[PDB]
């Protein structure tokens, strides 16, 4: 009866902390110890260590030790995680792992969407049209679209022409540029038989902020 | 103690071969008593949660399909995927736990190869209509290319400009099973009109001749 | 004895208190010929439940839905038998057992 | 067989009596082999999707309410509700699953015993706030009228013009023993400045003379 | 105890895709099959058909015959019935029912009572009440309701005028107007000699749009 | 088994009645009864009656005698209760549990909030930026906040450092003003000698109303 | 019509004492046959619903441990918390079902005496800019101290104006287990322009001398 749910809805500004915990339950408390590990943009799970309240005292991986000073409940069978001196470096996806005396990692939890951004104000995506400059010698087929730059927050998946050609739109993993806002690109190839005979409209679907803008590409 | 190195990064894996990616463990891991060792192998779908493949360094979980035949202990470790399917294409990990701490590599992506083909490289000059906002963006973008082994070179005034961003590349495309590497450049409007030369040199693997994209102001 | 299955229900039942012996051996290397083995079939669908030691010789059309077929087939009225379509040069695993 | 769609509309049924949901089958009980019949009952109340009520015209399962009283066989089918109550006042339908093509009929929409009455015609001036929206909305509303197939007469500016008014009857009433029709007048504000009088003339059964109030220019 | 449950609010735009599913439960899927029905949103019920997936060939009634590509799955416990060129007039709920070797439509689920529009543009809800100006010389009683504008979808529950008469729940059958959203009205009886003691106040109780504005008429 | 499920807070103007019951199931209409329990914002409870299964004869509390309308449904073994022209102390959440032959209530339902308001729509409270005026000689520590007034419905959260720890979230025991709308604030810990090195921003982030507004205090 | 009184009037009592909760009945509860008294005591958690403690005056509920003891006699039977527990932190009620109507009291809410800590109270001078907003919202903050019988004192130029001040408190916390307060001030426009001094002065038990803050023109 293992039930693990990470929780806590907050949208956080720089300089604060974060607490992602697992509401563990189902079996005898001291039988297993349940430990934590870090995920950043689809890279290897960086395991940090663990604390046993039935053991109480603190000793971790030397590499991920000092920043945390943690409380944990034996009564609710709930484990919590918090490292201190938080900056953008530890802005990462957080998982908690169930120990087995046979193998180490087979069954994982939901995960959390925790990002420590550098105080980016909520601003809509500024559509930037792109047009050719030299002769139309791209080769194979024509390529035109609308550039998406300096937007907040994630994510963007672009639907095309009122929900008709909507298979295969893609989104980058998110990084913070020197610009101070996320700059992610999403564009698709368009058939070469529609050179003029079709109208070009961009339909960005930035759902979290509920902004919907229209623009014609030439 | 023990440190682990994941490799290779991106190389096609086929159906029916015996998978072998270079995962290194620095010391022998033969646990003295009962001579029983303990190992765990990962499979994570793209962005998903990981899962076990081979435990006890020799044996697999019961009830798992026969694509999985792995083992390894001490310094010897090797993941094996037989009949790699289109959904088995993702990144695989290796990790020991004979001794704290755990060490995790940079990531190993297995791919699927097909017949040689390449896309035409594009160039993206900014439209002059957008100049209403007061910003001009000259960007070099390569999108929908296979295999993933392509690269972008930044040269401005014959000076190498690098080390200004950390990258996280696109995954498989649904249309043509391709990828995308993109770098974004931001400048000011004032110097935009009095400076003209910004270009990128593309050396894609699938091209038979050196392609030199260039643009002229004013035609 | 005590097992179940579509074969055990509509092809051949066997008593729970069965005290006997059974002999089988491979015989598909000449009793078959290329072009699918429609010679040996197995019953899938039957409207009336079979009892132990009862013969199935009726070839009634399957009656799929609540609306009766009653002599007229079509939607929700589908044929109850299909062939094996096995290849003659396969191993015993793809082959019948002569009992 | 023929797909059943009842016509003509009216075949009187009563609430609380031996209720009759009348739909006949084109076939007798002449089931060719072994004589099995195939009859169902799906009756749609508010929101609830009907379940199994009757199967094979003679037997219901254990736990099925005894409201069904067996009567009729052959080319006819008729179901009687036992002690019709507030739970038993709803829209009625019947179904059989004997032969091609399978269909659900129109069913019977229930009406209850009470005498025909007159509409509650009254005149109400439009508020100043609503007129600001660009449309003039005068409410002309009717209460306590009957039957299912009725008609409403609309006359505009001494010229017989139809197809410019909206009419819809109200469902089985809950409390005040009243049926109603919702009419929201659909015109432009331009007509309000080039025409002066907007009045409704209702000529249903319940009235002796139509109700027509007169007003002066400017409300 | 075979149970199939509906799922998914439906506001279907034409020319779009549709997600067909029926969560079969209470039985191993190789024993009993699925038969489907459409409800004509307040017309005669419409029989269409189903499938016994042993070979998969099916024919429905005319409207559900061949518009799209017909599929089925005997394994993952889902039967498939879909439509292409979905319009407002046939905008209906995809009902499916378990079968019995005796009777075809055996068990339903909770169901989804869904009212569907063809993706008309949204319009803001503006309160437009109507109240008399001079004294009401009609005599005895009157009949008036309040306008609830631009709501989607159903339902509403309404009470009227401080319980002057204990009736006043009224939500009439509506028709498709040009605005893309239906129009609501009610009826109430209130004595006319209450100039000062009783007022006309309408509570917009459209749950989907979360609109709640009252008004005191002087 | 004995399951009684109630849900759905209803806001109706005074004078009408709402339809809420406590539905038992599975047993003949012969034996057991019911209680309703109303709590009035940290004041006495408001019992209103119980149903006698054998005859249908009803009980009144003497003070609120004629308030209850008498209904019973023997076939379903459960009836519905409705109250009209109640007073302000009955204007709150409704609770009940199926009455037990030993004691009063054992296991409950979710309940429904009914409060009598004077047709008042939600009017936004005035938010102002905060800057210190006099010297900080209050003593102990530093604490300041923005006054949030007249909110509905629950809950409301104003964030300090985007609300990291559970300090700054609270639920007051209920009190009724003229409109009965509440005033919720947050608690923050700040050193008294560090006035000038920190930023303090107050925003209204009422989740139910779909409100998200940006604001900068210099 | 029927009165039953709990006790005490107030008691700042701690976790770990032996707190007294009793609720009195109109007459002695004992009758001959079955030797039992129809009465039950309840505890309500904050947000949660009341839960049973004692029934029939002698025994204890299955699921309710021996922490609570069944005792008392005649008109009263006792609610005793043996070493009041960490999960007992909530209000304590009494319930009666011995004489109708079911009439209820407020119950016992077990607060604790602690030394007062003063929150940083400040007031913001209203500029003429505020008149544009249309609503007056002056801020005076109280928090993190005890008890509920606190004070909000309003002095304006040595004049006492009353009838517009209220209080609002929170419940017990885990660490300090004090409360959070919210008092709202609304003023009239007439007093707004005719005076320069308006302030709130807190004078709770925990201070030594009330402080008379003042400021000079010029910031
Ligand atoms: C020797 O042969 C005789 C006669 O052939 C057998 O005698 C019968 O034995 C049974 C066993 O107890 C007696 O019991 C009855 O069995 C009835 C079931 O049979 C029914 O279904 C048959 C199947 O019909 C389908 O398939 C046939 C194909 O062969 C088609 O012709 C039909 O059209 C159908 O497609 C029917 O043919 C048959 O008529 C029945 O409908 C059961 O219904 C009865 O209630 C009862 O249990 C039966 O009475 C005996 N009848 C006679 C005439 O002897 C005998 O078993 C064989 N073996 C031995 C050892 O004697
Ligand atoms: C489903 O249908 C079967 C009949 O279908 C039969 O199934 C096999 C046994 C084969 O013989 C098939 O060829 C054949 O189609 C029902 O079984 C029996 O049905 C008859 C109806 O003709 C029942 O007779 C009556 O049923 C009523 C019910 O109210 C009783 O009160 C009467 O006393 C009389 O028995 C018979 O009871 C029934 N037998 C059993 C054991 O059920 C089956 O009932 C039916 N099930 C459902 C849920 O509809
Ligand atoms: C783990 O190993 C133990 C050996 O003590 C065995 O009993 C158990 O079945 C193993 N678990 C699994 C999932 O194989």
**DSSP notation for E2-68:** -EEE------PPTT-------EEESS-TTT--EEEEE--SSS--EEEEEE-TTT------GGGSSSS
- Tokens (6 digits) for A168: 């295969």
Q: Rg of chain F's alpha carbons, rounded to an integer?
A: 24
Using CB atoms within 10 Å of the CB of residue E140, give its burial: 0 to 12 exposed, 13 to 18 middle, 19+ buried.
exposed
The answer to whether the beta carbons of residues E210 and E218 sit under 8 Å apart is no
Locate all alpha helices (DSSP H) within chain A, ordered by sequence.
none
Atom 45, ligand 2: residue with shortest CA distance: E102
Q: Are strands B108-111 and B10-12 parallel, antiparallel or unpaired?
A: parallel
- Please report residues of E whose CB lies closer than 8 A to that of C65: 35, 50, 52, 99, 104
- Which residues lie closer than 8 Å to G60 by C-beta, 6 or more apart? G54, G66, G68, G69, G70
Q: Is it true that the peptide bond before F84 is cis, omega within 30 degrees of 0? A: no
Q: Which of the 8 DSSP states describes residue B121?
A: P
C-alpha to C-alpha distance for G219 and G197, rounded to whole angstroms: 15
Q: C51 CB under 6 A from ligand 1?
A: no
A189 and B144 in contact by Cβ < 8 A?
yes
CA distance G99 to A147: 78
Beta-carbon neighbour count of residue A132 at 10 Å?
A: 18
What is the stated resolution of the deposited model, in angstroms? 4.7
What is d(CA F200, CA C94) in angstroms, rounded to the nearest whole number?
77
* B111 sits in which H/E element: strand B108-111
The CA distance from G75 to G96, in Å, is 11
Pocket test for ligand 2, best of D59, D62, D97 (most atoms within 8 A of CB): D59
Q: What is the helix (H) or strand (E) element at residue G200, kind and residue range?
A: strand G199-201
Query: Quick check: F126 and G1 CB within 8 A?
Result: no
Q: Method used for this model?
A: cryo-EM
- Is F217 within 8 Å of chain G by CB? no
Nearest chain F CA: its distance from A8 CA (Å): 10
Q: Are E200 and E164 in contact (CB under 8 A)?
A: no
C-alpha span between C80 and G188 (Å, rounded): 89
Q: Which chains touch F (3 or more CB pairs under 8 A)?
A: A, E, G
How far does the centroid of ligand 3 lie from the alpha carbon of residue B77, in Å?
Answer: 22
Is the minimum distance from the CB of C22 to ligand 1 under 6 angstroms? no
CB contact under 8 A, F162 and A16: yes
Instruction: Establish whether chain D is in contact with chain G, requiring a minimum of 3 CB pairs below 8 angstroms.
Output: no
- Whether the CB of A1 is below 8 Å from some CB of chain F: the reply is no
Beta carbons within 8 Å of C68's beta carbon, 6+ residues apart: D31, D36, D38, D98, D99
Residues in chain E: 218
- CB C57 less than 6 A from any atom of ligand 1: yes
Q: Report strand pairing: E78-79 vs E72-73.
A: antiparallel
Q: CB atoms < 10 A from the CB of G72, how many?
A: 20
C47 C-beta closer than 6 A to ligand 2: yes
- Supply the DSSP symbol for A54: T
Residue G201, classed as helix, strand or coil, is strand
E121 touches chain A (CB under 8 A): no
D55 lines ligand 2 (CB under 6 A): yes
Q: Which of E174, E170, E162, E160 is nearest to E202 (CA)?
A: E160
User: Which of C47, C58, C71 should be mutated for ligand 1, with most atoms under 8 A from CB?
Assistant: C58
In angstroms, rounded to a whole number, what is the distance separating the alpha carbons of residues A145 and A143?
7
> Rounded to a whole number, what is the largest CA-CA distance in chain B?
80
| Smallest Cα distance from E137 to chain F, Å | 26
Q: Do C76 and E50 touch (CB under 8 A)?
A: yes
Give the integer Cα–Cα distance in Å for A217 and D162. 48
Residues of D in contact with C74 (CB under 8 A): 100
> Which of A18, A121, A122 lies at the smallest CB-CB distance from F164?
A18
Q: Is G184 in contact with F147 (CB distance < 8 Å)?
A: yes
Chain F positions in Cβ-Cβ contact with residue G141 (cut-off 8 Å): 143-145, 185
**C65 at interface of E, judged by CB pairs closer than 8 A:** yes
Ligand 1 and C4: CB distance under 6 A = no
For residue E102, the CA-to-ligand 2 centroid distance in Å is 9
Q: In chain G, whose CA is at the least distance from the CA of F99?
A: G97
Q: What number of H helices and E strands is found in chain C? A: 1, 0
Ligand 1 neighbour C53 (Cβ under 6 A): no
Look at residue A115 and give its three-state secondary structure.
coil
Residue with the smallest CA separation from ligand 2 atom 2 is E102
CB within 8 Å: F164 and A13: no
- Whether the CB of C70 sits within 6 Å of ligand 1: no
* Spatial distance between the Cα atoms of G145 and G111, rounded to a whole number of angstroms: 12
CA B20 vs CA B85, B111, G174: distances in Å: 17, 13, 56
As a whole number of angstroms, the distance between CA D80 and CA D16 comes to 9
- Rounded Cα distance between D68 and D60, Å, is 9
Cα of E130 to nearest chain D Cα, Å: 5
Q: Please, which residues have CB within 8 angstroms of residue F6's CB and are 6 or more apart in sequence?
A: F20, F21, F22, F94, F95, F96, F109, F110, F111, F112
Q: What is the CA angle B58-A27-G64, rounded to 5?
A: 170
Would the CB atoms of E132 and D124 count as touching at under 8 Å?
yes
Alpha carbon dihedral D18, D21, D26, D31, in 10-degree steps, equals -70
Q: What angle do CA A108, A112, A118 make, to 5 degrees?
A: 145
What the block records as the tokens of F105 is: 């209530």
> For chain G, first and last CA: distance in Å?
62
DSSP reduced 3-state for B77: strand
E45: number of CA atoms within 13 Å, CB side? 25
Contacts of residue G29, Cβ cutoff 8 Å, sequence gap at least 6 = G37, G38, G39, G57, G74, G75, G77, G98
Q: Which residues of A touch B216 (CB under 8 A)?
A: 133-134
Q: Which residues pair with G155 in a beta bridge?
A: G199
Phi and psi for G98 in degrees, rounded to 5? -105, -30
C-alpha D14: how far from chain center: 15
Q: Distance between CA E207 and CA E156 in Å, rounded?
A: 7
In Å, how far is A77's CA from the nearest CA of chain B? 23
3-class DSSP state of D181:
strand
* Distance in angstroms (rounded) separating the CA atoms of residues E198 and E194: 5
| Total residues belonging to chain F | 218
Contacts across the C-D interface (CB distance below 8 Å)? 22
Residue nearest to atom 11 of ligand 1 (CA): C54
Rounded distance between C-alpha atoms, residue E6 and residue E94, angstroms: 8
Q: Provide the token pair at B86.
A: 């289109």
Using CA atoms, how far apart are residues B102 and B95, in angstroms rounded to an integer? 7
φ and ψ at residue B191, rounded to 5 degrees? -85, -5
**CA E31 to ligand 2 centroid distance, Å:** 19
Chains that touch C (3 or more CB pairs under 8 A): D, E
Cβ proximity of D38 and C67 under 8 Å: yes
Q: How many CA atoms lie within 13 A of B88 on its CB side?
A: 16
Is cis: bond before B156, omega within 30 of 0? no
The Cα G22–Cα G76 span in angstroms is 7
Nearest to A19 by CA among A77, A94, A87: A94
In the reported structure, the alpha carbon of residue D60 is separated from the centroid of ligand 2 by a whole-number distance in angstroms of 10
β-partners of residue F113 are F93
- Chain B residues whose beta carbon lies within 8 Å of the beta carbon of residue A130: 124-127
**Ligand positioned closest to the Cα atom of B38:** 3
Find out whether the beta carbon of C68 lies less than 6 Å from any atom of ligand 2: no
Sequence-ordered list of residues with C-beta below 8 angstroms from that of D130, at least 6 positions apart, any chain: D137, E128, E129, E130, E147
Cα-Cα end-to-end distance for chain F: 61
Among the listed residues G205, G183, G170, the one whose alpha carbon sits nearest the alpha carbon of residue G123: G183
| B157 lies within 8 A of chain A by CB | no
- Which has the closest alpha carbon to D152: D182, D122, D197, D111? D182
Residue C22 to chain E, least CA–CA distance (Å): 30
The total of other beta-carbon atoms located within 10 Å of residue G165's CB is 16
What value does the CA radius of gyration of chain A take, rounded to a whole number of Å? Answer: 23
* DSSP bridge pairs for C74: C77
CA distance E38 to chain C (A): 18
Handedness of CA E143, E146, E149, E155 (dihedral sign): negative
Residues in F touching A122 (Cβ below 8 Å) = 212, 214
Which pair of structure tokens corresponds to residue B22? 């270079």
Contact (CB, 8 A) for E142 and E203: no
Cβ atoms of C99 and C32 within 8 Å: the answer is: no
Distance CA F161, CA B20 (A): 49
Touch of C by G (3+ CB pairs closer than 8 Å): no
How far is it, in rounded angstroms, from Cα A214 to Cα B3? 53
Q: Are E136 and E32 in contact (CB under 8 A)?
A: no
List of residues 6+ apart from E21 with CB closer than 8 A: E7, E8, E78
Closest-CA residue to F57 (of F47, F46, F68, F44): F68
Distance CA F66, CA F60 (A): 7
E74 inside 8 A of chain C by CB: no
Assign F83 to helix, strand or coil. strand
Q: How far are the Cα atoms of F177, G140, G150, G202 from residue G164, in angstroms, in the given order?
A: 11, 14, 16, 16
Out of F14, F121, F210, closest to residue E212 by CB: F121
F78 in Cβ contact with F24 (< 8 Å) = yes
């Amino acid at each position: 009866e293992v039930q693990l749910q990470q929780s806590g809805p907050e949208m956080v500004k720089p300089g604060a902390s974060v607490k992602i915990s697992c509401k563990t339950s189902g079996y005898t408390f001291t039988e297993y110890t349940i430990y934590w590990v870090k995920q950043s943009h689809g890279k290897s799970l960086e395991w940090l260590g663990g604390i046993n309240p039935n053991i109480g005292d603190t000793t971790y991986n030397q590499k991920f030790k000092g920043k945390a000073t943690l409380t944990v409940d034996t009564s609710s069978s709930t484990a919590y995680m918090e490292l201190r001196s938080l900056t953008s470096e530890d802005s990462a996806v957080y998982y908690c792992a169930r120990e087995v005396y046979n193998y180490s990692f087979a069954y994982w939890g939901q995960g959390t969407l925790v990002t420590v951004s550098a105080a980016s104000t909520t601003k809509g995506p500024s559509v930037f049209p792109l047009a050719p400059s030299s002769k139309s010698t791209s080769g194979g087929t024509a390529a035109l679209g609308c550039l998406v730059k300096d937007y907040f927050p994630e994510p963007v998946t672009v639907s095309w022409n009122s929900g008709a050609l909507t298979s295969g739109v893609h989104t980058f993993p998110a990084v913070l540029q020197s610009s101070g806002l996320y700059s992610l690109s999403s564009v698709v190839t368009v058939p070469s038989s529609s050179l003029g005979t079709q109208t070009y409209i961009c339909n960005v679907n930035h759902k979290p902020s509920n902004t919907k803008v229209d623009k014609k590409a030439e | 103690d023990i440190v682990m190195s994941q490799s290779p990064s991106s190389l096609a894996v086929s159906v029916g071969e015996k998978v072998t990616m270079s995962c290194k463990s620095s010391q022998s891991l033969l646990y003295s008593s009962n001579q029983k060792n303990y190992l765990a192998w990962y499979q994570q779908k793209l962005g998903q949660t990981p899962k076990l493949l081979i435990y006890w360094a020799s044996s697999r979980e019961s009830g798992v399909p026969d694509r999985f035949t792995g083992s390894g202990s001490g310094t010897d470790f090797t993941l094996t995927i037989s009949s790699v399917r289109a959904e088995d294409l993702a990144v695989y990990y290796c990790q020991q736990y004979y001794r704290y701490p755990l060490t995790f590599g940079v990531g190993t992506k297995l791919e699927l190869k097909r017949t040689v083909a390449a896309p035409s490289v594009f160039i993206f000059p900014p439209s002059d209509e957008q100049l209403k906002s007061g910003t001009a963006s000259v960007v070099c973008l390569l999108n929908n290319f296979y295999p993933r082994e392509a690269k972008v070179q930044w040269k401005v005034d014959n000076a190498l400009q690098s080390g200004n961003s950390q990258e996280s590349v696109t995954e498989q495309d649904s249309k043509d099973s391709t990828y995308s590497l993109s770098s974004t450049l931001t400048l000011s409007k004032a110097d935009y009109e009095k400076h003209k030369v910004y270009a990128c040199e593309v050396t894609h693997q699938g091209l038979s001749s050196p392609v030199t994209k260039s643009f002229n102001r004013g035609e | 004895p005590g097992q179940t299955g579509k074969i055990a229900d509509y092809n051949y039942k066997l008593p729970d208190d069965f005290t006997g012996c059974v002999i089988a051996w491979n015989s598909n290397n000449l009793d078959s010929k290329v072009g699918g083995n429609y010679n040996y079939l197995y019953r899938l669908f039957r409207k009336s439940n079979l009892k132990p030691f009862e013969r199935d010789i009726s070839t009634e059309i399957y009656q799929a839905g609540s609306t009766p077929c009653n002599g007229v087939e079509g939607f929700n009225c589908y044929f109850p038998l299909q062939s094996y379509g096995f290849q003659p040069t396969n191993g015993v695993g793809y082959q019948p057992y002569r009992v």
